[PDB]
Symmetry: C2
Subunit: 421 residues, 2 copies
């Protein structure tokens, strides 16, 4: 109903303005050292890590630029984004070999100087969003320099797609855990995300062309050829690879001891698949193309997520399960909820099945009633199936506010579209 949509939008709007963005505005700007502080424990206090990761600094720039463009943050988020871009360029850009370094410490010195394409994707995404939001040409300038370096050093001109981890001087890292011989869903999906906003910023043919090529790589090489669900790791020739941990990480490794089939490799992420589908619909909007350009793929992603991933009884989306439809891990992790909020709305917009609005409300109620720590405003990172926190730090080097602010803004927008349709 229109009354229900209005209640849902108001719930998001009040929370975003009074809870989520103030958590960050009051804590994150480091005026002494530059850049952003993002290590906050279950009480919102500094947990002390001596880290300013490329991921945390670029995701922060993305959040503050995008929220400013959308009219949130009381006008102050543009200058917060500019503070972040100053840190990226002055502390994290390699003035000899080009590209952004993986890690600095809190004082701004480089501590991991490798060139990691997952981080460089977020640099392209955040810096393009930053120029779109502020008009400062530095964002586009360094996003384009980073794009150009990926084409030079990372694109595989034989098999297509990207190699993903390099030493500082752009030589390819070693095999296996060193990261130089796999191609992954994590990198290729986020390059589609980044290239969409790069093309939105520049309007240049090359960015349109290579955004479309990245979409084709995902659809034709990364998604399961029968089920359409994301497969995580490939060898260079796009045969499926055994899943491994890399030396370079950007998340905490969780093992759920009660998860099923822990040695199976047919596992796929409902959250990642929803994220891919709604980001693909956003790319198609930016490209001026209809969603049914990729009807079969979008339908497979969303159908699989709603049929298997949604916990109708307790609320929220499970972590992972098989391509063929068995759930493996029913813990409740934060970013997958965020990406299913946006994805279930876009599934309803395109596919028009009421199950997607039922799924949206299920996930929305889980997020507001269980996952948000309303005392502080941030989201618990990991919970039991029934919604009891397992891990309680509010944020760290890899959990900032990229998924949650974007899901609040993009959900309130899509709910408005649905009400108006």
């Amino acid at each position: 109903t229109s009354e229900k949509i209005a209640s849902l939008r108001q719930e998001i709007e009040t929370y975003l303005n009074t809870g989520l963005l103030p958590f960050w505005i009051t804590r994150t700007v480091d005026k002494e050292n530059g850049g952003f502080l993002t290590h906050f424990d279950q009480f919102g206090n500094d947990s002390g890590e001596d880290e300013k990761s490329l991921i945390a600094q670029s995701r922060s720039v993305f959040t503050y630029s995008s929220a400013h463009r959308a009219g949130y943050g009381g006008g102050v988020l543009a200058e917060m984004a500019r503070h972040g871009v100053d840190y990226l360029i002055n502390n994290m850009w390699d003035n000899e070999h080009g590209g952004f370094y993986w890690m600095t410490n809190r004082k701004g010195e480089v501590t991991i100087d490798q060139k990691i394409v997952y981080g460089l994707s977020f640099c392209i995404y955040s810096l393009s969003e930053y120029t779109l939001a502020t008009g400062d040409p530095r964002g586009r300038e360094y996003a384009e320099k980073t794009f150009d370096l990926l084409q030079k050093y990372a694109v595989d001109t034989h098999y297509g797609g990207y190699f993903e981890m390099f030493n500082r001087d752009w030589t390819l890292k070693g095999p296996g855990a060193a990261g130089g011989d796999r191609k992954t869903l994590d990198v290729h999906m986020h390059l589609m995300e980044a290239y969409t906003t790069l093309y939105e910023c520049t309007g240049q043919e090359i960015h349109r062309r290579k955004l479309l090529e990245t979409i084709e790589l995902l659809v034709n090489k990364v998604m399961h050829p029968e089920y359409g669900t994301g497969i995580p790791q490939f060898w260079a020739d796009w045969s499926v690879a055994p899943q491994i941990k890399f030396d370079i990480v950007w998340g905490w490794a969780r093992f759920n001891p009660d998860g099923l089939k822990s040695a199976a490799e047919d596992n796929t992420s409902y959250g990642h698949n929803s994220e891919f589908a709604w980001l693909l619909m956003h790319a198609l909007d930016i490209l001026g193309l209809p969603y049914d350009t990729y009807r079969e793929q979008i339908t497979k992603s969303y159908t699989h997520a709603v049929e298997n991933g949604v916990d109708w009884e307790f609320g929220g989306v499970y972590v992972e399960g098989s391509h063929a439809g068995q759930v493996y891990d029913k813990e409740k992790e934060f970013w997958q909820q965020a990406e299913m909020l946006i994805g279930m709305l876009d599934a309803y917009r395109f596919l028009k099945d009421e199950k997607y609005l039922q799924a949206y409300e299920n996930i929305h109620r889980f997020v507001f009633d269980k996952m948000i720590n309303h005392s502080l405003g941030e989201w618990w990172p990991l919970m039991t199936r029934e919604g009891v926190p397992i891990w309680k730090h509010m944020s760290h080097s890899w959990k900032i506010n990229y998924h949650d602010v974007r899901s609040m803004i993009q959900s309130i927008v899509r709910l408005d579209k649905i009400a108006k349709g």
Copy 2:
């Protein structure tokens, strides 16, 4: 016999020193306008075209650099190459969008400003050879800038390989004759050639890696999957395309009315296949890899050329025939003779079958006894099967001295290797 090899080498050496290089040294340097004059009729006189093509200027730089490095030209060819590089940079480089323009007129003004990857390959090849021969860092500087632009604008990150023709501002040209929707043997084989010498010059990992990727594209996508012989044109997805003429040309179009099966599209070039195989062996030498890294491919290329392409009765190599082994066109064109001289020697070195030395001597006798215009020192461009000139201009915008000087130098070297083995 050793006596025979010594006679063959002496014949080449005397001709190269006293006939071929003086033809060019006495005619080509344009001191008034810069760059090189290359339009000479059947009497060695200026035929008047108001053209300085990227192909003619870069191939000239390659010839004079490579011949100087080999100890030919009486010391004067390094400065001739430098004169050419001055013209390439000062008249043919696009200081706004980057890359070298396709065509200038004789006064040095740009008349076709498109960015054509076939020409840009010869820029990478010639400029890398120029730094190797002279130590002037400008060659490597602009070869690397051109490499970097090809990766940014031309590489297809989905299907692999390169799109091949662009407007001045690097937007992709239109479909069909405009050149923006085919991938070709001509471009991809010459990129392997150029990247070999780029990697010889720089020693950088990225150039090694992408040279190897280009070799793999050729072997896995461009050569016939059964016969190993080059297929000329593909769509972007590497399905075979109907052969078409492009608006942008770099040769004169010849029709042999007595050629067989003129509408067949299973035609392949013995000269191109020999050129590919010996350039691949040269790449493997530069890479420090054994020839049997690609034994099957090299054997198919050379076996097909000697079994079908060599005119045992009259001498020389035919123009083209089918992958499966029927000869279509028995005219005698100049560059295929040059590339079979080098290729038949390397076929003997690797495969050790005496038929390849018999083929070498057949082609060598044809070149010296029929094709060289000894009055002037250059090669007739096109002859009847029996060795009577059909076209008699000595040189033009597309026929300079790239194939013939290289075949003389590289043949006298390989004959020495064979004698010493």
